[PDB]
């Protein structure tokens, strides 16, 4: 649950992402894959990537980064009223991709890391607080659907 002022911070930060969605999406996935190499094994189309240089050179990884952040941005713009947008993603990630909630924690922290890396000194403590709360809400509502499905 976020206040109006917190949502305003989230959507202000998101403007930074929308200026370069592919570059942000690429770096988020690279941070996930290099920090948590077990996550790469869930992607049949990226498991061939052995080095970060190959990851950086992969145009399909940048494409998928655009898909991921476009979906997340659509959810964030609903300011919590995201049941219709979130349900299909919860279902596909639990039942088809088999993504444990832990990996959603990993990618949430990766987003925070990338924002500081690309905007050092321009991602203030209030903005980090609000973005963190928004990603916690996203993860918590996914977790509720995971529990319904019995997925661990």
The answer on whether 116 is annotated among ligand-binding residues is no
User: Which residues inside 67-126 make contact with ligand HEM, applying CB under 6 A?
Assistant: 67-68, 71-72, 89, 92-93, 97, 99, 103-104, 107
Of 43 and 129, CB closest to ligand HEM = 43
Distance between CA atoms of residues 113 and 3, nearest Å: 24
Of 5 and 45, CB closest to ligand HEM = 45
Taking the complex as a whole, the smallest distance from the CB of residue 147 to ligand HEM amounts, in Å, to 18
User: Which residues inside 15-44 make contact with ligand HEM, applying CB under 6 A?
Assistant: 39, 42-44
Distance between CA atoms of residues 32 and 15, nearest Å: 22
Q: Residue 61, Cβ neighbours under 10 Å: how many?
A: 22
138 CB-near residues (< 8 Å, 6+ apart): 72, 75, 76, 82, 86, 104, 108
The answer on whether 64 is annotated among ligand-binding residues is yes
Contact between residue 7 and residue 79 where contact means Cβ atoms under 8 Å apart? yes
Tokens of 59: 């145009």
Of 99 and 130, CB closest to ligand HEM = 99
> In the complex, which residues of this chain contact ligand HEM (CB under 6 A)?
39, 42-45, 67-68, 71-72, 89, 92-93, 97, 99, 103-104, 107
């Amino acid at each position: 649950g976020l206040s109006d002022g917190e949502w305003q911070q989230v959507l202000n930060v998101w403007g930074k992402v929308e200026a370069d969605i592919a570059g942000h999406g690429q770096e988020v996935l690279i941070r996930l894959f290099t920090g948590h190499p077990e996550t790469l094994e869930k992607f049949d189309k990226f498991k061939h990537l052995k080095t970060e240089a190959e990851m950086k050179a992969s145009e399909d990884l940048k494409k998928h980064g655009t898909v991921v952040l476009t979906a997340l941005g659509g959810i964030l713009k609903k300011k919590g009223h995201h049941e219709a947008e979130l349900k299909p993603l919860a279902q596909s990630h639990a039942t088809k991709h088999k993504i444990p909630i832990k990996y959603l924690e990993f990618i949430s922290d990766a987003i925070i890391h990338v924002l500081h890396s690309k905007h050092p000194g321009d991602f203030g403590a209030d903005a980090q607080g609000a973005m963190t709360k928004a990603l916690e809400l996203f993860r918590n509502d996914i977790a509720a659907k995971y529990k319904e499905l019995g997925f661990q």
